[PDB]
């Protein structure tokens, strides 16, 4: 590899190379100790 690495300057081009066409209880509460 000679050319410097890069991120595709154009990504918009890809478009053309892709596949082209309430519960309440006192039960659970009773136990808590605030």
């Amino acid at each position: 590899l000679p050319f410097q690495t890069r991120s595709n300057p154009i990504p918009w081009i890809n478009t053309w190379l892709v596949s082209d066409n309430s519960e309440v209880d006192t039960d659970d509460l009773s136990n808590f100790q605030l």
Binding site: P11, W12, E23, T26, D28, L34
Partner: protein, 735 residues
């Protein structure tokens, strides 16, 4: 040929090149950023005589629309394209004019206050010009930038003209807030503070940045007001609210006093009409400045859960109901205490009374938890007294519903806001909290709109960026830089209502808020749900608080000591490190690290310049100006989204590059338990109440219906760890 209209006004031919070079200036030192992309994105439509400004405008929004998670830099890319436009639209040229020259120019224009030209000689100005780093404008993320183009900057709202710049703004405020300072430390602090805020190390309230250095003398943000059952009292409240909403301030009304419906008036000559009639008026006042009632004027009302109309009140925020039976423009905060929760766990009832049909029943609620308990049972078993029984399991249930149904009905545990408050329950009992829900200050009713006695909680606050300090120690400097600077505003901002000025100068309550807590916990690996941040949090907040009290205590020598300091428990030798709920030790085993006793005495001997320095408030705009995370609550997603005036805004969470794993997004949390546990810890050091909000996800609950069980369960959890208040319940909407 082709034409173009340079912002200068003159004409020119189209120069396709000149555009490119501009994008380059931005793409400079960036990746994943395609110069060609933004162009095609923008579909920039050319037409003769098109202004160059508009052309430039197009790309700005285009680049901002390409700010995706995969393109974190685009956020900064567009940011650079933006900063350019602004500076040139206010200076004619890309490089802003000297500190002195500018300050003067804008003065005679009515935009900058000449107050500076008098407290600072040319030399000092041209000197400060050195500290100014215009280049810091290139350190903004477009999210923050867009906001600056409106709220923060000095500009002409009719014409559009922008008169000011991003560091220009910073420095002026720093000095204009330290002007009345000794000749020797004054230039110094002017810089040390400038850098502290210019580097996003300490964010300040929106109201401040705009007006320090302009004509207006008012910095007030959130205020509280207690109304008296007495007819006259309410009329005053009505006026006050309007005076304060007229200066765009959030309102914190407490009508828990209005005597209940049916209660005697004048003996038996006339029976009372109820609280509701008085409550709705309160709303028209806060909206006295609002167009269509759609936006503006925020009023949060507070009241006792044992009120004789508690049932009446819950319905009102709900939209499903008759008009005259619903006040839906304002939020409500249900007041609860230790006896209340008890009844629920015992499936026992809750006798509803009227504030005026019972003696000592109210006052006791706020200050003493025994009396209210002793008194309660007395009348409870008394028949003479208009009462109304309702199964606890039946009440708490209703309340909780409206809370998830709207997400505006908050909660406030009184006992904790008095047994863990810098103030004394007897002398200055806290009866209420503000719209933001984060302010625990004492309150008094007003016989007149300008009553001498009246107290109007005034809160001024600033914020510390945890994502901007390398070690806990760095706070100690920033602490004094904030506490000092803040305390100064109190003497620079005029107070509309007298009851406020007196109540303000009196205790000088200072609210300090921390932001970017999400990034912090992630930068250390810990999270909210596992609670591995419990200790990390304890140690962190322990510091933030320590240095603040030391910064204040220190000032308790330099500029006197507090007017009312005696009232507070701090003077009584009581510290906020020995009042927290004992339940907490159970989720945190990180012992204190900085000598506290040193201040326990230093503050006994000297005092404090303020009455409060610790509070937590959720701020929309302080957080994004530093590209930081909102208050403490974790972000809902890596790619933050919002609509600006333009309507597209993107803010990548601090450092998405290595931080993706460590972030526990608000919805990624298994349950609310984790969140609370950390909050309860913060309280152990917070003088005033954290804006902790609960979040639920129906999509995760059997039969897709948040179970009442869980909702109630959580409330107990908060009360168990000494949590002061509750804030938005936001459900998992968008499905």
């Amino acid at each position: 040929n082709l034409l173009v209209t340079k912002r200068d006004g003159s004409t020119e031919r189209i120069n396709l090149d000149k555009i490119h070079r501009v994008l380059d200036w931005a793409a400079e030192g960036l990746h994943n950023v395609s110069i060609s992309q933004v162009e095609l994105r923008s579909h920039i439509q050319f037409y003769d005589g098109i202004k160059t400004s508009d052309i430039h405008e197009t790309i700005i929004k285009a680049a901002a629309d390409l700010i995706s998670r995969d393109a974190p830099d685009y956020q900064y890319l567009a940011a650079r394209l933006a900063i350019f436009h602004l500076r040139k639209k206010a200076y004619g040229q890309f490089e802003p004019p000297a500190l002195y020259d500018h300050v003067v120019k804008m003065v005679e224009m009515g935009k900058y206050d000449n107050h500076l030209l008098e407290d600072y000689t040319e030399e000092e100005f041209k000197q400060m010009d050195t500290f100014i780093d215009h280049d810091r404008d290139m350190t903004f993320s477009y999210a923050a930038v867009k906001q600056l183009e409106g709220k923060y900057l000095v500009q002409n709202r009719v014409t559009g003209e922008i008169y000011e710049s991003a560091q220009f703004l910073y420095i002026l405020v720093a000095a204009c807030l330290f002007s009345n300072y000794p000749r020797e430390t004054r230039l110094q602090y002017v810089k040390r503070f400038y850098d502290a805020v210019s580097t996003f190390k300490i964010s300040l309230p929106t109201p401040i940045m705009s007006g320090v250095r302009t004509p207006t003398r008012q910095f007030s943000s959130c205020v509280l007001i207690e109304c008296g059952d007495s007819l006259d009292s309410i009329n005053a409240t009505s006026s006050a609210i309007v005076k304060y909403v007229s200066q765009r301030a959030g309102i914190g009304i407490n009508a828990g006093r209005i005597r209940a419906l049916g209660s005697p008036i004048r003996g038996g000559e006339a029976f009372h009409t109820g609280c509701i009639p008085f409550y709705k008026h309160f709303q028209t006042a806060v909206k006295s400045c609002s167009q269509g009632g759609v936006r503006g004027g925020a009023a949060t009302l507070f009241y006792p859960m044992w009120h004789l109309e508690v049932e009446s009140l819950l319905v009102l925020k709900n939209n499903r109901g008759v008009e005259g039976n619903r006040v839906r423009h304002m939020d409500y905060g249900v007041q609860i205490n230790k006896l209340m929760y008890t009844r629920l766990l015992k499936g026992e009832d809750i006798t509803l009374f009227s504030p005026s049909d019972v003696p000592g029943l109210y006052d006791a609620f706020f200050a003493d938890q025994e009396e209210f308990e002793r008194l309660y049972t007395k009348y409870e078993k008394d028949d003479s007294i208009r009462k109304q029984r309702v199964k606890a399991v039946e009440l708490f249930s209703l309340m909780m519903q409206e809370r998830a149904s709207t997400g505006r009905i908050y909660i406030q545990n009184v006992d904790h806001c008095n047994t863990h408050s810098p103030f004394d329950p007897a002398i200055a009992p806290v009866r209420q909290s503000n719209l933001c829900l984060e302010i625990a200050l004492p309150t008094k009713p007003l016989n007149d709109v300008n009553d001498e006695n009246g107290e109007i909680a005034l809160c001024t606050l600033s914020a510390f960026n945890l994502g901007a300090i390398n070690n806990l120690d760095e706070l100690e400097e920033l602490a004094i830089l904030a506490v000092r600077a803040l305390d100064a505003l109190l003497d620079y901002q005029d107070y509309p209502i007298p009851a406020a000025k007196r109540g303000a100068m009196g205790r000088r309550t200072l609210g300090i808020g921390v932001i970017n807590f999400a990034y912090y916990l992630a930068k250390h690996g810990k999270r909210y749900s596992d609670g591995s941040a419990n200790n990390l949090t304890h140690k962190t907040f322990e510091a933030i608080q320590y240095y603040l009290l030391k910064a204040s205590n220190e000032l308790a020598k330099e500029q006197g000591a507090c007017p009312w300091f005696n009232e507070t428990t701090y003077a009584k030798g009581i510290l906020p490190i020995d009042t927290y709920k004992k339940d907490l030790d159970t989720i945190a085993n990180e012992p204190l690290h900085y000598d506290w006793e040193a201040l326990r005495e230093s503050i006994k001997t000297h005092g404090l310049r303020n009455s409060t320095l610790s509070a937590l408030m959720p701020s929309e705009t302080s957080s994004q100006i530093s590209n930081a995370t909102n208050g403490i609550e974790p972000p809902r997603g890596y790619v933050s989204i919002k609509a600006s005036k333009d309507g597209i805004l993107r803010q990548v969470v601090p450092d998405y590059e290595h931080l993706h794993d460590a972030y526990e997004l608000l919805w990624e949390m298994p349950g609310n338990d984790g969140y609370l546990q950390l909050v309860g810890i913060m309280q152990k050091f917070i003088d005033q109440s954290i804006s902790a909000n609960t979040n639920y996800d129906p999509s995760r609950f059997p039969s897709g219906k948040v179970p009442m069980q869980q909702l109630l369960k959580d409330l107990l959890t908060a009360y168990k760890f000494g949590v002061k208040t509750l804030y938005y319940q936001n459900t998992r909407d968008g499905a």
